[PDB]
Ligand binder design. Structure first.
Ligand code: ZN
Lengths: 214, 177, 309
């Protein structure tokens, strides 16, 4: 029901705004379920908050959209104080960013990037994220590793569109190169078959010539 | 190394194409030194036996290189380095002699690292032809372990897609006919 | 011409049925060519069955030493595997089915019977042998086909055999390679017995437009993940069995050659030894091409996916 709640707040943001909107955004950061904040950021009233006097909540929402937990630790003075639900949601988002790059995460990295002291609560946060269908993976405790098979994606600041285009172009070029290599293999196999047929017909011609000789 | 191999091949060709059947003393000196560089002891020994004694008597430097080669055959590194740095080598022999000196260092460095889990500092110093103390900092900067109490050194032992596709196509072509 | 085999020549079939060359040789029929359609239908019916034996009739024709199966159809009978000539209960049905098939342009007549052995290999039991003997007493040119749908699925390779019986009293000649099958304890005892009893027909088949439609459609989507790993040969049961049979064949060839060195002037032994060595070599070769193609597909796809960019 997070998407339905997200859409209702989107409809409400089209009208009422201001301190109510900032409190509403704080409720979004506290209400579990919402893992995508890109749709909220594109509302015109969020842009109204940009030129508005209040900016702590906007910088808070901006960090949830693009920043991670370590950036939030750096901005503990310019951001409104979070709740236990807001902190866990941001920690889950940070884990998503970490799992996006590397599919295997050692426990040392988990204890470092997330201000995690007790490993017990680290396991509790990891299982909580998985059971809310955020990340799919497996935990290796003997090697102290977190193997993540699948994870949800994240938002884009419209500056990564160029990177997406470059990646798609690279994929297309690689596919075309593999196709050309396959076609070259077609040609080489056909040439080898033609050479075998030429050898066979040469043998047959030699046999027929000897038969005519005798 | 690559230039030394090219120089060796050129010197080898000149010996085969010798007009009077004998090569110039610089060619023989270069050939003998280059064989020692590559640790080709058999070729160095056979070439020394091939050289007439007249050149050996008229060129005492040739005997000095052979004496070093005998030391290399016996693999007495403290003796090898002493003999290398004892005789003055001409401008055609000094650079290649230093390359042999460097080659001996790398060889003995690898021999100790592979074979010797532990080695006395004096023994390692003798093997590398350097005194003990700066040899220790040379290997500590190499990420090795040294025990000061027992003076023991603990060395730390250290296809493209197109080629694969060509090989697999060769597999199929060979097995198809 | 790919479609030449689909042409039906009635007079030519009548001429072959009047000639009866199979009466001159009990090993006359050596090859069995099966259309895509027939095989597919049979497999589907057997798998719908699941663990119970089903059976049906095969429509087709003969061409030299080759028996050709063009189509098949299920028979509504009980007692497949327990009743001798169970097919007989469907006589009336068979007559009507064929009559109605002729009305829509199915010209080929009965060429054999097929039945399934779910999870116990492909062979002829005492009952199957009695049935096919009767089927070769009135309708001499009859081929018995046996399919294991369960092993097809588990092995990832079609498990089908085509068989013909020997007449009562007649003994088979020296040759009989007999590929070993993993039939259950007592079922395998009876299997050795009946592999000594009958003779298999070299599966030949024919690539056609029916095959072209199937291969194209299924590979496009059922193999969107053309991956399906890449090595269903990983199971060390088929390739390993072929390797062991190869080893046994070459060991027997060496045993024959060693004894043949004392006899001076035995050409037939040399001929047989050379032929056996050649057959073993070709079998090993084809296994090698299969493995190489598997690795090639694996390498191309996994390289592309893992490290495209
Ligand atoms: Zn049966």
């Amino acid at each position: 029901p997070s998407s339905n709640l997200l859409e209702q707040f989107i409809l409400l943001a089209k009208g009422t705004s201001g301190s109510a909107l900032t409190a509403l955004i704080s409720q979004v950061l506290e209400a579990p379920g919402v893992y995508v904040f890109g749709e909220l950021l594109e509302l015109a009233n969020v842009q109204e908050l940009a030129e508005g006097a209040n900016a702590a909540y906007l910088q808070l929402l901006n960090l949830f959209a693009y920043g991670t937990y370590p950036d939030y630790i750096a901005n503990k003075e310019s951001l409104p104080e979070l709740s236990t639900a807001q902190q866990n949601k941001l920690k889950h988002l940070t884990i998503v960013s970490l799992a996006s790059r590397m599919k295997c995460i050692p426990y040392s990295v988990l204890l470092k990037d997330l201000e995690m002291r007790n490993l017990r609560e680290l396991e509790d946060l990891i299982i909580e994220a998985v059971y809310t269908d955020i990340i799919q993976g497996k935990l290796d405790q003997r090697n102290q590793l977190l193997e993540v098979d699948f994870c949800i994606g994240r938002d884009i600041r419209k500056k990564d569109i160029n990177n997406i285009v470059k990646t798609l172009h690279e994929w297309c070029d690689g596919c075309e190169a593999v196709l050309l290599g396959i076609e070259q293999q077609v040609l080489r196999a056909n040439q080898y078959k033609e050479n075998h047929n030429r050898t066979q017909q040469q043998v047959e011609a030699e046999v027929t010539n000897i038969k005519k000789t005798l | 190394a690559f230039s030394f191999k090219k120089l060796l091949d050129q010197c080898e060709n000149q010996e085969l194409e010798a007009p009077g059947g004998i090569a110039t003393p610089p060619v023989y000196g270069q050939l003998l030194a280059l064989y020692l560089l590559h640790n080709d002891m058999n070729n160095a020994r056979y070439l020394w036996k091939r050289i007439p004694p007249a050149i050996k008597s008229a060129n005492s430097e040739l005997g000095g290189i052979w004496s070093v080669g005998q030391r290399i055959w016996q693999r007495d590194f403290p003796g090898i380095y002493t003999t290398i740095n004892a005789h003055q080598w001409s401008e055609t022999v000094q650079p290649i002699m230093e390359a042999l000196r460097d080659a001996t260092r790398r060889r003995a460095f690898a021999l100790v690292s592979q074979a010797y889990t532990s080695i006395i500092a004096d023994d390692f110093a003798a093997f590398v032809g350097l005194p003990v103390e700066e040899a220790v900092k040379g290997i500590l900067e190499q990420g090795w372990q040294a025990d000061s109490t027992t003076r023991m050194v603990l060395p730390r032992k250290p296809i493209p897609n197109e080629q694969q596709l060509a090989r697999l196509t060769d597999y199929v072509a060979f097995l198809e006919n | 011409s790919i479609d030449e085999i689909y042409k039906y020549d009635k007079k030519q079939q009548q001429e072959i049925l009047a000639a009866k060359p199979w009466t001159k040789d009990h090993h006359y029929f050596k090859y069995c060519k099966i259309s895509a359609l027939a095989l597919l239908k049979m497999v589907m019916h057997a798998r719908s069955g699941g663990n119970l034996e089903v059976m049906g009739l095969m429509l087709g024709k003969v061409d030299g030493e080759t028996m050709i199966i063009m189509d098949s159809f299920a028979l509504p009978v009980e007692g497949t595997e327990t009743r001798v000539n169970a097919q007989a209960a469907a006589y009336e049905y068979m007559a009507a089915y064929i009559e109605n098939a002729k009305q829509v342009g199915r010209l080929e007549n009965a060429i054999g019977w097929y039945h399934s052995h779910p999870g116990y290999g492909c062979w002829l039991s005492g009952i199957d042998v009695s049935t096919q003997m009767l089927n070769q007493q009135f309708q001499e040119p009859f081929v018995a086909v046996v399919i294991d749908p369960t092993r097809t699925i588990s092995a990832g390779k079609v498990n089908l055999g085509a068989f013909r019986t020997y007449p009562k009293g007649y003994k088979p000649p020296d040759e009989g390679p007999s590929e070993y099958q993993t039939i259950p304890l007592n079922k395998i005892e009876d299997f050795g017995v009946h592999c000594k009893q009958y003779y298999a027909l070299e599966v030949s088949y024919f690539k056609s437009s029916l095959d072209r439609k199937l291969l194209e459609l299924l590979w496009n989507k059922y193999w969107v993940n053309t991956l399906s790993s890449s090595s269903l040969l990983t199971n060390a049961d088929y390739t390993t069995g072929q390797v062991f049979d190869l080893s046994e064949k070459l060991e027997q060839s060496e045993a024959q050659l060693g004894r043949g060195s004392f006899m001076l002037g035995l050409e037939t032994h040399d001929r047989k030894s050379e032929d056996k060595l050649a057959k073993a070599t070709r079998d090993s070769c084809k296994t090698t091409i299969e493995a190489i193609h598997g690795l090639m597909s694996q390498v191309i796809k996994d390289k592309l996916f893992n490290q495209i960019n």
